[PDB]
Design a protein around this ligand. Sequence first.
Ligand SMILES: NC(=[NH2+])c1ccc2[nH]c(-c3cccc(OC4CCCC4)c3[O-])nc2c1
Ligand SMILES: [Ca+2]
Length: 223
Amino acid sequence: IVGGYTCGANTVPYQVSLNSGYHFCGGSLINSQWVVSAAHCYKSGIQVRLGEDNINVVEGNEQFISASKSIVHPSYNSNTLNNDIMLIKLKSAASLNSRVASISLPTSCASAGTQCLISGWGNTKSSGTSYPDVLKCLKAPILSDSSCKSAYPGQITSNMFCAGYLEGGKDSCQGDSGGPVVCSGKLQGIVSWGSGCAQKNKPGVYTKVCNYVSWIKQTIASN
Ligand SMILES: NC(=[NH2+])c1ccc2[nH]c(-c3cccc(OC4CCCC4)c3[O-])nc2c1
Ligand SMILES: [Ca+2]
């Protein structure tokens, strides 16, 4: 997260770290056995780490659970990143409490101007790499579709939306992919991609979760 602030320990209880010997993507807990992340974060050997703040220190509240299976959306396109969403089923259910809680899926899509919270352990520099030990937060608004398509002509599909600041300075970045974009307590986006991090007129692009709620529900119901 570039231009953000330290969230405070366990203040984002639905945030998870996908780990394979190091943190490589974020994700969101939607019920005690499933996590939603981005399809491009897919790899085998994923251990999901819940209740984290410092990902390099066991401070208490952490729950490390292996993924039993990861379901990449069947229409995921790795060249355009269209349908960049993945569901991860946990080997055992997590124990939910005030520090580990799930976030609600939306019933309607959010409008431009809606303020959301984006979080993650990704790079905090736009020019260089500085990875934090604790979770960083950024409050950012959803941009209009016209500003988004004007910034990335021919690359935005209806399953994507832009959020951020056109003046540059605040953005999600490498290591934040797969994590949450929460607006008024509903999960509206998944960190997907961007051009560099926090550059002027290049806002971050997110997977539009409201377009996938029936897919998520039907997939969870059959697995
Ligand atoms: N500027 C942004 N809003 C942005 C947000 C998330 C990003 N994630 C990445 C990213 C870059 C290189 C490799 C990645 O993931 C690979 C390692 C884990 C598997 C895929 C990224 O997510 N760039 C990103 C840029
Ligand atoms: Ca820790």
